Design an enzyme around this catalytic site. Structure first.
Site, PDB file in Angstrom:
ATOM      1  N   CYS A 240      -1.037  -5.330   5.372  1.00 52.81           N
ATOM      2  CA  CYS A 240       0.014  -4.443   5.530  1.00 52.81           C
ATOM      3  C   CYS A 240      -0.759  -3.484   6.437  1.00 52.81           C
ATOM      4  O   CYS A 240      -0.470  -2.244   6.440  1.00 52.81           O
ATOM      5  CB  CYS A 240       0.614  -3.847   4.485  1.00 52.81           C
ATOM      6  SG  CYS A 240      -0.622  -3.241   3.179  1.00 52.81           S
TER       7      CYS A 240
ATOM      8  N   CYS B  59       0.790  -1.176   0.062  1.00 54.71           N
ATOM      9  CA  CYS B  59      -0.013   0.040  -0.056  1.00 54.71           C
ATOM     10  C   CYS B  59       0.853   1.275   0.043  1.00 54.71           C
ATOM     11  O   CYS B  59       0.345   2.320   0.188  1.00 54.71           O
ATOM     12  CB  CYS B  59      -1.049  -0.055   1.376  1.00 54.71           C
ATOM     13  SG  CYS B  59      -2.394   1.035   1.082  1.00 54.71           S
TER      14      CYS B  59
END
Lengths: 121, 142, 121, 142, 121, 142, 142, 121, 121, 142, 142, 121, 121, 142, 121
Positions: free
Chosen positions: G116, G46
């Site tokens: 994440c 990300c």
């Protein structure tokens, strides 16, 4: 109390005289103290830890403050308990109350104070 | 044991109600040559003094009133409250139930030290064991 | 008593008021049961020799004036003492110190007294 | 006993010295309705009579003065010295430790029952149990 | 300070130095194991209010965020632990804290965090 | 451990000699960003103030010198000597090998409480827990 | 610890209060050559960095402040806010007292990916695995 | 670092840098504690008379100071301690010294400094 | 006399007439053996190796020359004794002393001799 | 057992004092049809005889004195002195008490056989195995 | 160990390649209060002097370089090589693994013979444990 | 640390931050203690002859330059060792690896070096 | 000695010839190991005041240098010995004397010397 | 060993008397082709070679005299003395008896690494096992 | 001996005197009894193909040129052996080295000669 006639007594001629609380000892101790700790219990926003009776030995929850997990002492003696600051004790009866053998202090309703002073501070 | 029944016993603390009923430091007791104790605590660094005077009926043996004072730290007010709730409505045997450990885990924040506001047990054990020598019954004293 | 405090009995307004002493309380009666029992055991050419604690069995040894060896009670209770001059003695602490479970005598300093009553005669 | 440590108990005991230091035949006591006991035990043929009297403060409960007398046997003077050390500085519960067997087989020497020279413990067990009826505390007496 | 009581030390103006955090040590960090299961939670508007204490097996009940199971290992080493996302562990004390002796990550303050992060997610 | 061996070794007491040899309240240490503790402690109630300042080598990790101050109680002077004899001339393994009950049961006659007459273990533990945070090693601090 | 005690601490979220006290990436420390840690982690999934720099007192061994940062993942904001509640006001034996498994199953709801979004505790295991080395004691690090 | 000799190492090669003590082995550090006492408790007729040393139990014998019996706790962990006024302790080896899981203290000289304080008073 | 009376047979009018008392018989006196050697133990300059009580069962020995370990015979009889100069033999009560089943010898007052004859030669 | 209490009693030789009490080879005894034993044993290694003769009351059964002759070895004399300490002032159940293994390992260094010096108890076992028969009771012999 | 894996290993070692990497004994280090250890050892009966000085990055806790000197014995050259090889690119804890009986019995041959021809480990334990002392952490040392 | 992460590092913000060693918690130490005894173990024209792998035991084998044989200590504690020149050792985990009770040495990488020091000579 | 002769039925012509002590029976060696070892190990103000006696162990107890404890190997072999100064020695007999099997060395009168070298140093 | 028992034994020590007996390093032995061992050992840390030459009878096997030398350390003189007292008046089944263990914990202190001044039994284990070889009795040698 | 020294018994003033081949015990049998039962097993295409030890036992496994298995015998004996061409022996140590108690042989070098006499033919 071996009279076992609480209710048929106390109509003002022995109700103006002091009468000690009933003792069975064991049935009375379970009836009184275990549910004096349950009266405090859940259904309020003032927090609680709950009450326990894991194997018929009182194992009242004291998660955040103090350790007062009550156990039974190995054969030839009853009740093993350990204070986190003043050390161990052996509990036996003396008048139907559970009174220590090493300093003569009870715990009959001290546990009730502990729980509702853990939410005062 | 405890019955009302409501769960508002923890909503409002017992201590205020106890204080309100019969303030302070006066109580009720009978008069004879055996006479009630007087309890104190000290320390000038902390400043604390907790004057626990039992006033005990001598016709039932029940502590009708034992009232506290607090000087010094404001956390000894609360400590002496539950040392004047458990001990009332009972005899001297069951007014000696109290452990310092009751109030010494509640200002904790566990340390290896001990506070001067963990002394309210000793405050009233300077009064009830001064009423086991002046009441002339040292059986419960030791 | 479970005061369990370092000092804070010494500011001198409760040092003139009575309070419990010698009840700390699970090892106290192995410090005041051995208070001068084993003190007279050596380091003199007179007095009385060999009086000592073994592996945790505390004993009284005196030349021929008496014996106390700690014993255990029959099952359902523990700790027993015997005297050749009064036979069976039963023990366990009751509210503080040792207190007979036979009556109400205490062996707490009986052992100490007899060590030095064997130097008197 | 206490830690010092004293290994100089060699044909010396400070008990006799302690009796000499305090009077005899009165002590310290408070005047109130609870009042001090008085002890006696005697054997007429043997001619030995020991009068152990406790004079006990009635507001602290601690025996501060313990009188002894010994008549008849001279081997009983020593026996009375052990009823005038331990009992002091302590309350009745910590002064009810002693047994008749404590001093009796320390006189002599042959099997089972001994002589009758000693009576010292009996003398002060007629004095502390007459200060559990005059002190007004039955439970210890039985 | 192994006394675990040390009154009349540092009235808080002669301190100005690090202050030692308690050691008892047998049950000291079982009062740090949970510190929001009697001080917080239980009949609060948020989830997971249940608490259970056996006779030495006590943990917060948080199945979603993963529970830990306190167990004992066969005689040779004390305590056994099971973690869903990192497998079994062996635990012993270090200063009183309940930790694996292969690492410094305790479960002592982990359950303190996860009961009050159960409110969030 | 230790031996000398001499029969006259215990005739004298080490503490007075140790205190005497060093003159006076000055030690040896290294100078760097990590630095030696200070061990102030005080009780105005029992009147005893102390200060056990360690002076420790930072390049060998060996306590070279540490001295006590004792004010108030006069029987606390010789109980502050065990925090200036084991530690001196020895490692930081010997920094912690003491108890507060090591030195507080001797005057006693163990009571329920203890006494705050000597607070010398606490004093050097206000300095070696200030030398696990200034030393920069918090592993055995807590 | 120290509590009111009331469930008002569960009515408002602690993370918000924590964020409010000292925004952002600023703290308090002791300036000396063995310097405070730097806490970073990154996921390229990300493309975000979670920064949990600890700023630690080097003379008491207590983390004064650690302030989080979170980018990308909007459910990782809350994840990094409980790595700052615990460790502040507490020792470095309480700084390392938390696992990544503590926070890596709190959005579970058992999935296939733990995302994440729960890498926060690996940003303060990049701060104490940088601080304990700099502090000069990698005893509890490895 | 294990050998069988001291010598044939550092023959003034370096002498300005000393090095902290070795700890070979596990049960050798139960011999070091023993060693200290015999000229800090005995070889004089004044005060303290004996410190008992038993088989499979190590004891400390001091009259009123109190006694320390080094115990073992149920197999799973080795060595248990109970102090006459300090409360329960437990010890596990570190690098071969017996190190308390309390404050990190070692009983190598805890039970040696009480002993020579006996002589003083 | 087997009624445990030895008082009122001592004013002299029957104390002159032959009477023998020294019977323990076991339970019940140990002054005639165990701690008859306690006087002859150690305090004074003469060297004696042990008199010390074991775990609570009398195993009286003189490790110098007179090892006569007091034991119990396997069940169906009581008392077993060792000898260094004639090997072990079974023993049993006959008058409350431990009597040889070979022809009757009693080690009750013999071991008393041996201790103070072990410093003479 | 033995109580005085004096533990310097055996610091000096017992045997000399015992020998000194009855000068010289004359005891006290009674005579009727039961009549005192006579007891000798050789030892030509020494080249002499050890003669232990019990002189015993025949109306109380108590050994009043036992009179002994020893020549040769100077250690033989002190092996015939502990067979005259114990037995005197006691019964014939204390004359049947004594073991021949009592004095037979005191000089030694535990052997497996008696030496010439040791045979003293063999002369009092020639005195009780001749007295028992003459006294008219061989019951105790076997 | 580590699964590299060399399945082509015969009788060669890359220990020589490691030592050269930087000419002896110099390497790289950080500068601040944890100043690197200097370790020496000598044998007066084998003549070998080995100087091991670690050079450590202080802020990562990882020894960058360590190299050795060897004089005297030619069989002590190999012993020093392994010790230096192992601990580069590794933590201080990974350099506290090594035992002196790593090199002591791995020379020659029965337990009867032991030599001073290998003291290399001692020299790096006067540099990794003389480093810990200067690094202000004694909790991996003891 | 029981992070249990499978990466999610290297974008170069944590790759400028040192990463030492992350705990096993039980697995890794066993490994590398046999990964030079499974990479130079045998099956080469020159290298150490063999290491025999065993079930519930683990060893290094070298013809006569000795090794450390790993064993277990009777219930109370775990691990036991014997060697030709290091004598008896025991071990506990307390520094994040297996800590010797001799001086804190860890045997994980010692065996690695001994294998190729037996290839030296 | 098997002969059971240590004559006086000889003029000591036999004795002149080299003759070495041998212990018979199996209780004889007890008074040759603890005869020599305990002989200066109890009460004097020069050092060492007492020794303990136990069941299943009988050794010297000196708290001046540590001790040796004689153990017992599980049924298959009798006796064991261990020391933290020379490892697990292992034990039996071979001349009716205590013979350690490390090298066939005795220890019957060796440890005697460490009781009178406790004075020296 | 056997209890004589000397009560003045501790005050003196045999070692001085043993040294006094032989002027100077002179002993007694028999002469034949089987000959006495010659034994030395050198510790380079003690700085001296201790020469223990046994002089042994060859017709009884009894060590009449064994003499010592010591130089350097003053702590090794005592060790060598106690390795001549013990084996004199003993056979070679009571001088092949002796253990290093005797003197290997008497200069304790902590004997973490065996002190050089405890190697004075190796001096006579190079004499009595160099006796077995030259006397023609080796097996106890191995 | 009983040693604890291997260093400073070698500078050549005692190694010019015979320095005896010691046998002992838990330090000389582990790999010096396993000096050819794995040496010539592997790490070569030549030699003999195998000799291998068991797990928790040691065995000789030469293909058909005899065998040895270390065996045990019921309690009253520890360890036992068997040889193909002479029936069963019994094996026990007495000087550190294992020695048959059936005829006196040590298998220290029996299992060394055979191994390389099997390369021969």
């Amino acid at each position: 109390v071996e009279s076992s006639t609480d209710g048929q007594v106390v109509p003002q001629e022995v109700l103006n005289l002091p009468l000690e609380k009933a003792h069975e000892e064991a049935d009375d101790y379970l009836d009184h103290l275990l549910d004096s700790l349950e009266e405090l219990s859940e259904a309020h926003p003032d927090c609680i830890p709950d009450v326990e009776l894991s194997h018929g030995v009182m194992t009242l929850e004291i998660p955040a403050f103090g350790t007062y997990v009550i156990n039974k002492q190995p054969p030839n003696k009853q009740i093993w308990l350990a204070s986190p600051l003043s050390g161990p004790n052996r509990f036996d009866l003396l008048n139907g109350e559970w009174v220590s053998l090493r300093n003569g202090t009870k715990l009959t309703d001290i546990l009730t104070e502990e729980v509702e002073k853990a939410i005062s501070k | 044991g405890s019955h009302m029944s409501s769960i508002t016993k923890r909503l409002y603390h017992p201590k205020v109600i106890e204080h309100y009923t019969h303030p302070r430091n006066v109580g009720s007791l009978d008069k004879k040559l055996p006479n009630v104790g007087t309890g104190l605590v000290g320390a000038p660094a902390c400043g604390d003094v907790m004057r626990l005077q039992i006033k005990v009926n001598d016709s039932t043996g029940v502590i009708e009133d034992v009232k506290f004072k607090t000087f010094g730290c404001g956390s000894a007010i609360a400590s002496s409250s539950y040392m004047t709730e458990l001990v009332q409505g009972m005899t001297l045997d069951d007014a000696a139930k109290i452990k310092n450990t009751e109030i010494a885990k509640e200002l904790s924040l566990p340390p290896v030290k001990l506070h001067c506001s963990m002394l309210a047990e000793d405050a009233i054990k300077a009064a009830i064991k001064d009423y086991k020598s002046k009441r002339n019954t040292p059986t419960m004293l030791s």
